[PDB]
């Protein structure tokens with residue numbers, strides 16, 4: 001009933017490991033579906049081959065700009081940015097998957113993975129999933145970030161899809 005999807009993470013093209021996510025389709029169906037479909041690539045576009053453009057150790061890893069690859073782009077499966085679905089789920093700790101945005105109701109494809117409890121994001125960013133397996137891989141990804149977020153190596157989603 002709740003999809004599981006995975007990313008295979010690579011560092012400058014070399015496999016690091018697999019991160020899998022439970023998507024909370026029972027609580028945020030529209031936001032979950034967006035990420036799910038972009039993870040399978042089923043519409044002809046999505047996350048495969050894209051990079052994590054901003055990694056800030058102790059805070060979060062942000063990705064999802066598969067159109068411009070620099071953090072300015074990305075697009076939802078809905079033909080336009082979409083509304084903040086709800087704010088039921090909170091940023092409770094490491095592993096929380098949540099939507100990046102440019103203000104209220106501007107969800108696209110960019111998302112972030114928390115690497116700490118970030119409760120100050122509640123009510124601003126829509127939480128729609130959590131890491132299930134491979135949190136250690138997300139932690140390792142932090143090695144390649146910095147205080148301002150620029151990455152020291154290219155951190156990419158070499159492959160991704162749905163497991164369940």
Ligand SMILES: CC(C)[C@@H]1NC(=O)CCCC/C=C/C=C/CCOC(=O)[C@@H]2CCCN(N2)C(=O)[C@H](Cc2cccc(O)c2)NC1=O
Nearest residue numbers: 054060062071072073099100101102103110112121124149
């Ligand atoms: C999706 C994309 C088109 C979007 N871009 C625009 O709004 C234009 C200007 C961005 C300025 C960038 C600031 C970066 C600051 C570094 C620390 O915080 C971040 O990395 C945040 C973490 C939550 C997810 N997120 N970026 C975003 O959603 C950020 C906005 C943000 C910044 C800081 C705190 C915060 O809660 C939210 N938005 C974006 O990245």
